[PDB]
C-alpha cells in the first residue's frame, strides 16, 4: 500500500523520544506539529504510531528553554512512518530539536 | 568466600591489555599490524 506514491518523491521514518511525564498534549501537540509537517509534506503520512515508555540506557541533558534541569530514565518512543519530498527535511530536524517534548530525534530512510 | 579469583578470570574477557596498549603513543599501521597481526593470530 505504501509503494503507490513513491513515483515522485521519497520515504522516511523518524524516531523521536519524549518526556515521560505528560500524557496530555503529547499525542496531541506533537501530532499538531505533524500537521505542520503536513503543510510541508502532504503525502501518505500514515502510521505515526506510538510505542510504550520503557527505561532507556542512559540519558542526561534535556535543555529546556532556559531550564536545563531534568535528567531522565524513561521516555515515550514515537516514530513516524511518514513520506515526503527530500526537500525540507532539515526543517523537520530543527522542529524535532527545538521543541521541548522531543529530545534525541534521529530520522531514517528505510528502503 | 573462598580464595578463588574470577575477577582476573573474567578480566581477560575484555583485558586490561587495552590499557597497557593505550599508555604509549598513537602510532600507525606498522605497530598496529605488529600488535594486531599478533593479536589476530592469537585468537585463531
Amino acid at each position: 500500500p505504501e509503494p503507490q506514491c513513491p513515483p515522485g518523491l521519497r520515504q522516511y521514518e523518524t524516531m523521536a523520544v519524549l518526556r515521560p511525564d505528560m500524557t496530555e498534549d503529547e499525542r496531541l501537540t506533537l501530532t499538531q506539529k505533524y500537521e505542520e509537517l503536513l503543510v510541508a509534506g502532504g503525502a501518505m503520512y500514515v502510521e505515526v504510531f506510538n510505542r510504550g515508555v520503557i527505561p532507556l540506557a542512559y540519558s542526561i541533558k534535556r535543555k529546556n528553554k532556559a531550564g536545563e534541569t531534568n535528567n531522565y530514565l524513561d521516555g515515550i518512543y514515537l516514530l513516524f512512518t511518514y513520506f515526503t519530498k527530500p526537500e525540507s527535511i532539515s526543517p523537520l530536524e530543527a522542529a524535532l530539536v527545538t521543541d521541548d517534548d522531543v529530545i534525541r530525534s534521529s530520522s531514517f530512510k528505510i528502503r | 568466600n573462598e580464595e578463588r579469583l574470577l575477577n582476573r578470570f573474567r578480566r581477560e574477557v575484555m583485558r586490561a591489555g587495552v590499557i597497557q596498549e593505550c599508555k604509549r603513543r598513537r602510532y600507525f599501521e606498522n605497530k598496529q599490524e605488529e600488535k594486531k597481526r599478533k593479536h589476530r593470530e592469537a585468537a585463531k
Binding site: - | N1, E3, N7, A16, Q20, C22, R24, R25, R26
Partner: protein, 118 residues
C-alpha cells in the same frame, strides 16, 4: 565519626607504580584512604603486591569503629596491585558483595604520549 552505616564502597586506584585503597560511603564522603605511600615505604618498593596487601590492610583495619559488614569494591586501572588487594579484602573476609571495575576505557579521546624507546 560518620553516618554509621556498615555498607560502603571501596575504591582501589591500582596504578602502574602505586596503589591507593580508599573507602567511602554511598554518597561519596571518604571515611579513610590509605595508599602505598601512606604505609611507610616509598620509592621503587611502592606499587608491589606486598604494598597492596599492607596498604589494604592498614586501610580497612581502621574501619573497625564502623565494623562494615556489607562491602563492595570498585577497583580501577592496570598494575600489579589488584589481586593482592582482593586477597587482602577477602582475608579480612567482610561481606564483599561484588567487586567491579570502573577503569576509564576511552573511545579514542586524547592522544597518549610518545613511546619510550627504552
Amino acid at each position: 565519626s560518620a553516618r554509621k552505616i556498615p555498607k560502603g564502597v571501596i575504591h582501589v586506584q591500582a596504578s602502574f607504580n602505586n596503589t591507593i585503597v580508599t573507602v567511602t560511603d554511598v554518597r561519596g564522603r571518604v571515611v579513610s584512604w590509605a595508599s602505598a605511600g601512606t604505609c611507610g615505604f616509598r620509592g621503587t618498593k611502592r606499587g608491589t603486591p606486598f604494598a597492596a596487601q599492607t596498604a589494604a590492610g592498614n586501610a580497612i583495619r581502621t574501619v573497625v569503629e564502623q565494623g562494615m559488614q556489607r562491602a563492595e569494591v570498585m577497583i580501577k586501572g592496570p598494575g600489579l596491585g589488584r589481586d593482592a588487594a582482593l586477597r587482602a579484602i577477602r582475608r579480612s573476609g567482610i561481606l564483599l558483595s561484588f567487586v567491579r571495575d570502573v577503569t576509564p576505557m576511552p573511545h579514542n579521546g586524547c592522544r597518549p604520549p610518545k613511546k619510550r624507546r627504552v
